[PDB]
């Protein structure tokens, strides 16, 4: 019921390491997100395996898996390699070279593909990232999870953790009534560098970021999400 909908754009650029194929062999790529949405690039010749192809997808998964497969056609079609990408809304939107897994029955071992993968920021998502966290009633084990701060109403907000390839958060915390602030590193919690918490009558959630620049952005975002009057006290 706390649903996000992301635009996912995949721009397949080119491949390198395609030496075995004849120059006039047709190559193309398929790009798919788990859930049903699949797209193909145009046909390219092996002499020039390049596409300026933008594939526009759309998913409910904050942590989707993007499977890109390279094919040569003409007995079905032969897959020459694949990559599986795991992008987040914070992932780099630059073009990136990736190594493709090759069946080792074809001599294209240094076979790589250049790719851009972009997840847009929907308007009801205020902030996302990975965080160390433990709580009294939710996230009851010190563990790093992926979080999204979703605006669930004109005045209500929610801290939502997600698992891989899930449309709905695994757990969530309604932030109304909570007070967030920076805290000194809490003892006995192995993992986490820059700590903070969300606290209220009855509940306490401990948070830790790996970097303090990432902690500042979180604490400030959550301060506005809770509507607390207490201003956080940084170090």
Curated annotation (Swiss-Prot):
It is found in: Synapse; Cytoplasmic vesicle, Secretory vesicle, Neuronal dense core vesicle membrane. This is Calcium-dependent secretion activator 1. Changing residue 166 to E: Affects PtdIns(4,5)P2-binding, plasma membrane-association but not binding to DCVs. Transmembrane segments: none annotated. It comes from Rattus norvegicus (Rat). Interacts with the dopamine receptor DRD2. Interacts with RASL10B. Homodimer. The PH domain is essential for regulated exocytosis and binds phospholipids and plasma membrane. It however does not mediate binding to DCVs. Specifically expressed in neural and endocrine secretory tissues. Expressed in brain, pancreas, hypothalamus, pituitary and adrenal but not in heart, placenta, lung, liver, skeletal muscle or kidney. In brain, it is absent from the cell body layers of the hippocampus and dentate gyrus but abundant in the synaptic neuropil, except for the stratum lucidum and stratum lacunosum moleculare where it is not detected. In the cerebellum, it is mainly detected in the glomeruli of the granule cell layer where it colocalized with synaptophysin. Calcium-binding protein involved in exocytosis of vesicles filled with neurotransmitters and neuropeptides. Probably acts upstream of fusion in the biogenesis or maintenance of mature secretory vesicles. Regulates catecholamine loading of DCVs. May specifically mediate the Ca(2+)-dependent exocytosis of large dense-core vesicles (DCVs) and other dense-core vesicles by acting as a PtdIns(4,5)P2-binding protein that acts at prefusion step following ATP-dependent priming and participates in DCVs-membrane fusion. Residues 124-227 form the PH domain. Changing residue 81 to E: Loss of function. Residues 1-98 form the C2 domain.
């Amino acid at each position: 019921d706390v649903l996000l909908s992301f635009s996912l754009e995949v721009v397949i650029m080119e491949v390198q390491g395609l030496k075995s194929l004849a120059p006039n062999r047709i190559v193309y790529c398929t790009m798919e997100v788990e859930g049903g949405e699949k797209l193909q690039t145009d046909q390219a010749e092996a002499s020039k395996p390049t596409w300026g192809t933008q594939g526009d997808f759309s998913t409910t998964h904050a942590l989707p898996a993007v499977k890109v497969k390279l094919f040569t056609e003409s007995l079905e079609d032969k897959e020459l390699g694949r990559v599986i990408l795991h992008p987040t809304p914070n992932s780099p939107k630059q073009s990136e070279w990736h190594k493709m897994t090759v069946s080792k029955n074809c001599p294209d071992q240094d076979l790589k593909i250049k790719l851009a993968v972009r997840m847009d920021k929907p308007q009801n998502m205020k902030h996302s990232g990975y965080l160390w966290t433990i709580g009294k009633n939710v996230w009851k084990r010190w563990k790093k999870r992926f979080f999204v701060l979703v605006q669930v109403s004109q005045y209500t907000f929610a801290m939502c953790s997600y698992r891989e390839k899930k449309a709905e958060p695994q757990e969530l915390l309604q932030l109304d009534g909570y007070t967030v602030d920076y805290t000194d590193p809490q003892p006995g919690l192995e993992g986490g560098r820059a700590f903070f918490n969300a606290v209220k009558e009855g509940d306490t959630v401990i948070f830790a970021s790996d970097d303090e620049q990432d902690r500042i952005l979180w604490v400030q975002a959550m301060y506005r999400a809770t509507g607390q009057s207490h201003k956080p006290v940084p170090p």
